[PDB]
Design a protein around this nucleic acid. Structure first.
Length: 66
DNA sequence: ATAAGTCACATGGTGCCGAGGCCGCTCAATTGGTCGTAGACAGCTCTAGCACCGCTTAAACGCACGTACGCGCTGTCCCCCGCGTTTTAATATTAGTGTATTTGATTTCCGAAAGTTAAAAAAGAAATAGTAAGAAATATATATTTCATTGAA
């Protein structure tokens, strides 16, 4: 779930009958609109570890050598 | 006779404090207006529950008889109370921790409210099957006829 804000959907704060706290929003999923979710603040992970693996090769061939 | 100087004397004026009066600020209470809404009021037509009466009889009252249980008497036995003397925790006094409720603040939740809108359904008509009564089909028992056979006119 990864809930760290516990703050309601800003577009959904208008009619805040429920708040499922799901990403992007349970109310938006009921509403079927992800674009409206992006318009608000509203507080993708498998590429960071491979890039860190790649960093070791980068700093050896740029900073140390070259 | 008078200008100038002395001495006291009576009053003018300026200043902070005290007491009374007015005013503004705020909060609560009260009342009038207003308008959506509901209740009183006629008004009408309909169910519907008494008055009567016949009647048929199930039920009820009355008189007489008796015996099944209510109570009274008398024994005999168990059976809580009454003291007397030991035991034993209730109980009031501090007290300390560690829960356990309560109050503000807030912030995210949940349903009253209003407006459309579609489904459940209610009434009425038609189909159809259940059931009872009637008529026909038929199986069966019995009389009747006819022929054969064997004994009488």
């Amino acid at each position: 779930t990864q809930l760290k804000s516990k703050h309601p959907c800003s577009v959904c704060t208008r009619r805040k009958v429920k708040c499922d706290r799901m990403i992007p929003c349970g109310n938006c999923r009921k509403r079927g609109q992800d674009s409206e979710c992006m318009k608000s603040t509203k507080l993708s992970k498998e590429y960071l570890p491979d890039l860190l693996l790649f960093w070791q090769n980068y700093e050896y061939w740029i900073t140390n050598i070259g």
